[PDB]
């Protein structure tokens, strides 16, 4: 298929251009004599139609593709591995070819010897293009050089990449003037490429039994600056704190050596969405857990690990008497309280920018 | 069979229509070039006759009914998923088809089955083409089943079977009566309010049982107790009467769609451990003891008050600390601030239920009645 | 076989004669249109012959008899093969029947597909199983048409004892000086199996050179019998006195209130109460008793949220000071639950009294 | 072989005749219709010469003899079951035939083994088969239902007298001067086995290829006083039955549904040699562990289970509270140090009729 | 080959004779009617050369030499097995043969083994099988069992009289100038393997091909060290002379019991411990086997054998807190009691303690 069937992967489609340019003409690459990459990985949640891009890759490169799931390859005994050979065996044949490993995590058991083999052809020396949900499920060995050493990172469409979306399986069917995407766009937020032509489908279904009606079928406009305050809060702290480095973007799209002084103004910023939570709806939501959880690691990590700890001492605690046990739960509740603290009167001081932020991220989702 | 032969069904009746439709007349959906559901899930208890429905939805439709249960697929090697493949490729002969997968769960999560499921996936998701095959699947254990098996297209549709009331357990009975010889003196309505939550296949059984008894020789009542009070209505009446009446009063809760005897802020997660520990209360205020019935109530109730305190730093005294080993002081902390939460929350419950206790009351004998209600 | 062979099971047999009365005239069923079960469960301990009853099923209905065994059915789909095999060959001598003994064995590993074949095949002749130990199977089993019937077979009583001696004394030589009634009652709880052993080992130990005596001992109390009757009798008389227990439908020497959960809890504590009210000292006999009750206690204070001091609170992990909390309530609840049995037991000690000897003596009543 | 080549045996030869008379007669038994056992077990420690017993009964009988062991048939799949069957079939040829199964324990107790058994336990119920187990307990209960191993007989280690005996028999296959007494070796070696003592000879005729030597012997396989050490182990356990109401008097006493006051009475017993040790030799020995280990195990019973416990009352404790952890550790200390008064105060009175079994025991080796 | 290829095995070489003696003459054995020993076991740490040993022996009596190694056998399923079966059916044709099983312990531990072993018992209860194992006590204890390796033969690390022996016989196999004493690297590698010290030369002749350069070899791999040695092992055995229920060592190297014989022992434990104070005022890490074979016997006298004082006549092997401390102090009482009955005899005789020390690091062994 086209780059022009894929909505707001702007970034992703000159990332993946580089891919495209190689499969078409290497020479440019063999002129300087250049190693191409054997391997390019799309990193990003179901639905974020990694598939697609990688079709697109070899349409607009007017390549071979070759489709092949990491549930299929992993068989009885080296079959799965055989299989492996095989697609590479044939997929050579249609040079310049795509291969696309969908739930490359899929691929211990005959799968060691199957990943083995995929590592095999790839060092060979065809460009194998990779989709995974759970990344850090990965073997290292992977992202080595050459094999998967490239990675592109998939978002969630934003407002703007959703009403783009709808709009090209709008298409598909006999939609009326009436129904407005924008409208729609904002209505899902976060949602994914293939839920929202799901939601078109619903509704083109619903007619011909006969969108809003589709919308009921995925079993807050205030909800939004709750989670625009967590995302204000989080990010606002990086300008302020001197040992943090400000962030690239703030979205409220779900992205489903250090010195003490370091860690400390993390831990800081963890804290950012439970403080403007109630400096804002002075009531704390459930969306902090993993900003708490990793303040407490760290926390933990300075007092057990690290020997940061003032009470507790240069000791690594990582089986111990229970007095030793109250000691650390004591000095990881200081460092935590206080690191809250310093991020709740930062972000009571700049109140009226964090509120700025908010509205903001309410309108436009994502800035940096 | 026909929908006429389903009974208690009207709503998930009109929902399953959408797919007599399509099966039908295609092209209607293809006009405007729609995507039709490739699979349809069917969640129920036993007996529920989740099967029954998908035979009548061909029969609607006059479509071709391959039945196939998950505990066959789940073979040596590759066996399964030649079975399925197998299935798929006759299914396709036979099209417009249905095929019905019983234990969905059995095969819906590796092992054989991984590749058996991976194959039930790559077999529905078909392709763009039309097929004009229908995939039907029954699990009683939905949770069970793997993320994938709910995408789009595959068993994107999901249609929920409800034990039958009162008036759709007297209408069950009179369908099996008919098979057999039912003498004018058993009334099929004493026994629909005698066997409240009973399942579609539990009265037919009840029949046979009797038709059984006869064969040695009202009778009926013989074989009720082979199987192996009204007071007991009211109590439960009580436990959803007190669950149900807080959603009203109770401002960050949401009024219960129905009631049958059959990122979330504090002050959200605070109403529902309120809202569990209802039926708690309304059953100390009526019948002033306390049922076993209470169980997941109260174990959901602490589960929210040990998030709230544990890991969404919700707690006053334990603080903004994420818990999950700890000391022991620490321990009492988390232990002490959940039961005060707890405590709370019943009290904000036991008092709002005293009050309105008219109210509650009157729910009760209302269920003893319509069983549902909205 | 006959059921003439099967001994002191009237109830048993007669509950049998539905299925045998199916299997030589099915149509008086299929004329009003009634489905017949497909299968029916034996319950019962080792020796009760749950085997020797679905034999003479057959032959009081003149019909073939395919004995299975769980243990047999595997490599991989053996087994299941095997399953469909029997029901293939099984189908042919309809009506027959198929015997599963130990179907626990195939009630994880192929067995799981063993299972899925025999539910698979039932689906599709009577089926007939025998376990020892139920609770291990799938609720599957037990769903309509398939297992669909259970059938419970008891140790013998005195009466079936003393019956069962004397068909296995046929198959011997054994003198009229021997009075079985006496080895019936010497031998209380004894099995089918058990008591035809002892004739065999006396009969080999009479080839060897009354006799029956010295094999009792190869198994290498009167008073006893009291006791077992005082633990069954305070549990039993405590149904009648206690407001929210149903009275026992037996007695032998072989949506829950708070209310009725503890008066269970002081049934439980019925026969450690008696023990002491009568012989002034507690058997080990109580242990599954106190276990239960202890569980219905812990049930209260920490899942059930019926705990005073515990409270509302689902405990099922916490601190120590919590835990002391639960063990306190718990021993409340038991000791008072005890008290009051005790209590019921020691004023009414006199018709507790009257169904020890009694039990002694017709060893079962209602 | 005969019964004469077995020694000390004469309780368990007569044990075995009744199987011998079947196998030679079995007409006798079918006369009053009696069905003959089909399995015969024999329990005992290793050199017991289990296996000799067996091809004696055959030889008494002049019956066929098939030693089969239980490691043999343990077989890739189905193989060790047709070996069974194979052996049972061949074995039903040479009818009346005794097939022998060392190491019953190997077949006895999660695949094959499974199938192996049925097969074993299938054939059986179909010849009188023996089997021989070091370790009865670890075989299944299935094995030990009427028919299959529905007898079992019990070989002891051999006494002073069966020691000698035995010396004497194995004596003959060499040239051992009448200068050498194998009453003075018997005594020497207590709780030795038939083929420990076996052993002893042969290493003594190796010795004589350098040509009193048989002592020699004794120190290459590498008291009087220990001797007495047990003989008060032993004298403390069986003396307490006769004067404990609810203990029932020892069947025999070597150096080689129940009432509290039942339960008690054993823990005293138990007791027993631990007193006896301290009353003679004033220290104790190790040899208490599992003495102690039983007593501890009925008292913990008692308190936890049974509810037989003053303090901890009638509750199942079988996780609890320290509180509650300390009551029981409590009582069940109690409750033993009782007992062992009890039995260290019998003992003291009645300490002379105590030291009379110790040397008796140190003479006679055994008594009732 | 020869039992002169073997160095510093006298004692080890007469305890083989009797075997070697069996296969050459088997009817002297055979005359009285006396069964012969099937099975042969060599136990020694490894490089001890328990392979050369059974070669010689076969050599000093012309038999025929079958190595096998328990890695071998050790095969998809039966295999293994047929491989035993194989190995002596063969083995059985050139009779009188020894048989070589290197490694036991691999075959000796169910799983392919389980049957493979039971072929190698079943093979040898029908040719003299030797076998070496690093590892003894994790064999089966049918192994063992008379006739299957009934016999059993210690082979030790060489001494420095061994050592330099040893060097002599590999240093013919190379080019080594009168220059280079062997004695001088013989004490310079104690506790040395047969195999460690001809590696040795093997380097140094290496490093010669390159071109005092044996010296270089050594540091491819202290004099002080030997007498900190000399003090674990001088306290440890001085002790048993002085303790009643103890028995004397048969040696001494730098390479149903009562209550009083329990003690005596934790007292021996803790001789190491001790000299190494008395002596060098230091402990070193070399206690901790000393110290938790001490702390084993302590807690099983308290917990198992009922022989605590406070702890009383329980079988505590799931307990209360307040019980825990009741045993971890009993411990300490019992532990240091011994410690100090031990710290003092050491203490007196100290004189005694650095006599041995001083001729351990000239003897190395002592009696
Ligand atoms: N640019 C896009 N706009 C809209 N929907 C898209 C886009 N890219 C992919 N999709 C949808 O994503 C789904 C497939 O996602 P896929 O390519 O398989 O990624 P994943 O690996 O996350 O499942 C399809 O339903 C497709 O319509
Ligand atoms: N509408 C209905 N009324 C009465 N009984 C019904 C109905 N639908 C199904 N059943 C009964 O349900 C049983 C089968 O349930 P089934 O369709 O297999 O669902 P499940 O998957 O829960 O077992 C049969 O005994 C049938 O008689
Ligand atoms: N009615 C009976 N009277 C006496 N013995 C019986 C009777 N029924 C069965 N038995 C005995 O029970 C044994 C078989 O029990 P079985 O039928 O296999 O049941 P289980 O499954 O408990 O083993 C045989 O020894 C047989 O003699
Ligand atoms: N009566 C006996 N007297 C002496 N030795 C005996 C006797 N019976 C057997 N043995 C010895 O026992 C050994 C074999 O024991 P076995 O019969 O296999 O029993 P186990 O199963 O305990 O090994 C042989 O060495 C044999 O000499
Ligand atoms: N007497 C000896 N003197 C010196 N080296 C020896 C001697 N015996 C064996 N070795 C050495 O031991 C090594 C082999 O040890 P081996 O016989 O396999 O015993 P292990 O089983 O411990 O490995 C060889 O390098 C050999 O040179
Ligand atoms: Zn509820
Ligand atoms: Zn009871
Ligand atoms: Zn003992
Ligand atoms: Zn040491």
Not at 86 to 114: G, M, W, Y
Not at 144 to 149: A, E, K, L, S
Not at 229 to 257: F, N, Q
Request: net charge negative; hydrophobic share 40%.
């Amino acid at each position: 298929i086209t780059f022009k069937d894929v909505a707001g992967q702007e970034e992703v489609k000159q990332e993946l251009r580089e891919v495209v340019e190689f499969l078409k003409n290497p020479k440019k690459f063999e002129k300087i004599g250049a190693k191409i990459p054997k391997g390019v990985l799309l990193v990003g949640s179901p639905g974020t139609g990694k598939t697609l891009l990688a079709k697109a890759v070899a349409g607009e490169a007017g390549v071979s593709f070759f489709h092949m799931s990491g549930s299929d390859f992993v068989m009885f005994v080296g079959v799965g591995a055989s299989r492996v050979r095989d697609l590479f065996d044939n997929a050579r044949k249609n040079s310049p070819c795509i291969i696309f490993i969908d739930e490359l995590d899929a691929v211990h058991d005959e799968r060691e010897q199957t990943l083995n083999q995929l590592l095999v052809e790839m060092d060979g020396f065809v460009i194998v293009m990779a989709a995974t949900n759970r990344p850090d499920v990965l073997d290292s060995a992977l992202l080595r050089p050459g094999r998967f050493d490239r990675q592109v990172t998939v978002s969630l469409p934003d407002i703007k990449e959703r009403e783009a979306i709808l709009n090209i399986h709008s298409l598909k069917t006999k939609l009326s003037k009436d129904i407005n995407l924008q409208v729609i766009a904002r209505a899902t937020p976060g949602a994914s490429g293939a839920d929202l032509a799901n939601l078109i489908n619903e509704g083109a279904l619903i007619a011909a039994r006969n969108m809003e009606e589709a919308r009921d079928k995925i079993l807050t406009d205030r909800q939004k600056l709750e989670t625009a305050y967590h995302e204000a809060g989080h990010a606002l702290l990086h300008y302020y704190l001197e040992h943090a480095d400000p962030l690239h973007k703030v979205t409220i799209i779900p992205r489903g050596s250090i010195n003490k002084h370091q860690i400390l103004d993390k831990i800081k910023i963890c804290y950012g969405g439970y403080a403007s939570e109630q400096i804002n709806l002075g009531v704390t939501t459930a969306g902090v857990q993993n900003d708490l959880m990793q303040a407490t690691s760290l926390a933990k990590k300075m007092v057990t690990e690290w020997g940061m700890g003032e009470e507790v001492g240069p000791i690594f605690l990582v089986a111990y008497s229970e007095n030793t046990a109250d000691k650390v739960d004591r000095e990881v509740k200081r460092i935590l309280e206080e690191c809250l603290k310093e991020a709740s009167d930062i972000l009571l001081k700049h109140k009226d920018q964090l509120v700025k932020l908010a509205k903001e991220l309410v309108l436009k989702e994502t800035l940096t």
